[PDB]
Amino acid sequence: AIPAFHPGELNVYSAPGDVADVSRALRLTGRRVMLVPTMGALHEGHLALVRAAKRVPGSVVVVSIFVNPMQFGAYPRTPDDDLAQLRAEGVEIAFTPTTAAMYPDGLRTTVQPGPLAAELEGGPRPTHFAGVLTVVLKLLQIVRPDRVFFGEKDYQQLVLIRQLVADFNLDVAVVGVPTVREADGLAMSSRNRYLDPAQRAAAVALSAALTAAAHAATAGAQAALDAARAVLDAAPGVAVDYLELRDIGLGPMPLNGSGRLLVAARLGTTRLLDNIAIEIG
Amino acid sequence: IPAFHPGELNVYSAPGDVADVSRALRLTGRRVMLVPTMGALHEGHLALVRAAKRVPGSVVVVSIFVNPMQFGAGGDLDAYPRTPDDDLAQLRAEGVEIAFTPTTAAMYPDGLRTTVQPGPLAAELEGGPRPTHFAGVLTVVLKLLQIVRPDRVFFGEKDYQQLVLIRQLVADFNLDVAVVGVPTVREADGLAMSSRNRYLDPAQRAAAVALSAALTAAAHAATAGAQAALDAARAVLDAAPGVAVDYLELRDIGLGPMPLNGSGRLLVAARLGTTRLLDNIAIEIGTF
Numbered sequence A: 001a002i003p004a005f006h007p008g009e010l011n012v013y014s015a016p017g018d019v020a021d022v023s024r025a026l027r028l029t030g031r032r033v034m035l036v037p038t039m040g041a042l043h044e045g046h047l048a049l050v051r052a053a054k055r056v057p058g059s060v061v062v063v064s065i066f067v068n069p070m071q072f073g074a075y076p077r078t079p080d081d082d083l084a085q086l087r088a089e090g091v092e093i094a095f096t097p098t099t100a101a102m103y104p105d106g107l108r109t110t111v112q113p114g115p116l117a118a119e120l121e122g123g124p125r126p127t128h129f130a131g132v133l134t135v136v137l138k139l140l141q142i143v144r145p146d147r148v149f150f151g152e153k154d155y156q157q158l159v160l161i162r163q164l165v166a167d168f169n170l171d172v173a174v175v176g177v178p179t180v181r182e183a184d185g186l187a188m189s190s191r192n193r194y195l196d197p198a199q200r201a202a203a204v205a206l207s208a209a210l211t212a213a214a215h216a217a218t219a220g221a222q223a224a225l226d227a228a229r230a231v232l233d234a235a236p237g238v239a240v241d242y243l244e245l246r247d248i249g250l251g252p253m254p255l256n257g258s259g260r261l262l263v264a265a266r267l268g269t270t271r272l273l274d275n276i277a278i279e280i281g
Numbered sequence B: 001i002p003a004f005h006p007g008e009l010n011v012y013s014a015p016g017d018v019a020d021v022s023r024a025l026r027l028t029g030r031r032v033m034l035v036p037t038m039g040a041l042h043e044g045h046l047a048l049v050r051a052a053k054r055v056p057g058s059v060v061v062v063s064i065f066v067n068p069m070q071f072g073a074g075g076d077l078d079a080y081p082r083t084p085d086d087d088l089a090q091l092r093a094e095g096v097e098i099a100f101t102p103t104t105a106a107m108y109p110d111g112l113r114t115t116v117q118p119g120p121l122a123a124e125l126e127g128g129p130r131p132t133h134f135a136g137v138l139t140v141v142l143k144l145l146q147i148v149r150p151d152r153v154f155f156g157e158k159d160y161q162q163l164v165l166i167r168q169l170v171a172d173f174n175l176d177v178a179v180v181g182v183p184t185v186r187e188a189d190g191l192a193m194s195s196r197n198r199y200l201d202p203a204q205r206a207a208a209v210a211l212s213a214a215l216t217a218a219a220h221a222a223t224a225g226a227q228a229a230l231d232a233a234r235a236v237l238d239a240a241p242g243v244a245v246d247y248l249e250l251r252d253i254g255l256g257p258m259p260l261n262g263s264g265r266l267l268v269a270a271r272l273g274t275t276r277l278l279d280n281i282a283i284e285i286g287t288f
């Protein structure tokens, strides 16, 4: 028998088989299942993902809350508050599995990403994306959503998930949602709370550098890169790990055309990242 | 949706075509059965097909694809037997409605990019000397399952380690498909059917009976314990001319990090000339 599902209410399921059965039943009833993968501690950035999923006609939104140990090398856990926010957004399904339910046999079969996973964010964390793709593949198989939502803020992650979907012939649409930003441009992130006042003010340099580059781009790729570097060079205590212009699939940037500029920097012990669309010329 | 002529063999090479047809069939209530093969079909494959065919209201999809990823450098890939015409004739004779025959470019348009990394069992037995073989197998099977989205997928017990690894793949990635193992089909004297049997000359073919003879002798000797079972198999293999044993191992049925306790599987791999043959059998320790 299919588990109970109360429309218009937030239905919480912890067992994978339960959400799998409900999702299947709902799709048969005329709903389009939308999956929004999270690790909890929800903020406006996550709500933008949720709102994107909810606006699809016939949508039933499934928000997974799962701190995936495999993508780590202390993590904030606010169950009650996260669920309240989801209820406030009109989300009808929350999937909150335990590590044991997701990995009943430990790490055995896993996903091995292509070479892009060793670059950029993969430099300091070479096994991070294998963890991300493995848990995302599992969530996709459990929930079987029509569309899955990820923030553009973690652009490399978004691109790797598009590679996962294409490479494994997955029947799901991957939707990238624009980065939600604080009033001064800083990309919203749970980790921002760790920045002291001086670091928080200096942190504006990442987004300022990216938007400066996007507008400098009419003058060419070098102009865009040099403008971004100048902005980052005007900030104290911002240790840039990388500032790279690539094509939209993160391969080498074209002579002209569309691309993406990505930056990551360390402010004290907090690593921040950001990125932006760039049109060369 | 491409054309689907019921009661006839429909051949599709494009992944999108078989995906669309399978989806359409599933939507009308028919249950889709997938039998993955690398072609060069023989009675062993037909047993998988018949097992699939008997599921009520099923539509059977047999994929034929010599997967380059599971072959290690060498002329192994080029040497693999290919008999496409006889294969399709056999499927028609079996009443199969769908054959999926993708091209290498359709399956690997981006070369080897995202792939499946099997658990530790993949580095053992068959994987010892071929460390990337099972990643090739699991990657292609994962793709075939996503393309066809069958309710059940059929594999032969002959390649027992492969069957176990596919069950791991399905469990580990939460795949919504039932894995069905089908008993090994054998020639009248016991030889496990295999497309590689065609490389045994008359003498090697005669000597090859030793693998199955050794396994069945071991299964009956097992009432006396594991040592008796293994020694009986070894004696039969040792009495066989021109049979070079690669390995003979008795393991728990899951072939995993668990000691043998009552129910096991005895696996053997041996070379007759350049032909490497495999076989395995269920073993019950201390049971008559």
Ligand SMILES: Nc1ncnc2c1ncn2[C@@H]1O[C@H](COP(=O)(O)CP(=O)(O)OP(=O)(O)O)[C@@H](O)[C@H]1O
Pocket (backbone or CB within 6 Å): A037, A038, A039, A040, A044, A045, A046, A048, A049, A149, A150, A151, A152, A153, A154, A177, A178, A179, A180, A181, A187, A188, A189, A190, A191, A192
């Ligand atoms: N500002 C933002 N705008 C849009 N999506 C965002 C976002 N911040 C995070 N997301 C998305 O929310 C999902 C969950 O990612 P998390 O890492 O759990 C949250 P986070 O804010 O990035 O925390 P973190 O600072 O610990 O990394 C991802 O798809 C992520 O890209």
Ligand SMILES: Nc1ncnc2c1ncn2[C@@H]1O[C@H](COP(=O)(O)CP(=O)(O)OP(=O)(O)O)[C@@H](O)[C@H]1O
Pocket (backbone or CB within 6 Å): B036, B037, B038, B039, B043, B044, B045, B047, B048, B154, B155, B156, B157, B158, B159, B182, B183, B184, B185, B186, B192, B193, B194, B195, B196, B197
């Ligand atoms: N004798 C047999 N009985 C039952 N299933 C068999 C079988 N021989 C092969 N199969 C199964 O048929 C499927 C396809 O395997 P193939 O590699 O295409 C044929 P093969 O005969 O095993 O070729 P090979 O000798 O070149 O390895 C596998 O699931 C395999 O285990």
Ligand SMILES: CC(C)(CO)[C@@H](O)C(=O)[O-]
Pocket (backbone or CB within 6 Å): B036, B037, B038, B065, B067, B070, B137, B140, B141, B159, B162
């Ligand atoms: C499972 C399989 C069809 C994958 O190519 C192949 O390994 C085989 O012949 O068993």
Ligand SMILES: [Mg+2]
Pocket (backbone or CB within 6 Å): A154
């Ligand atoms: Mg994050």
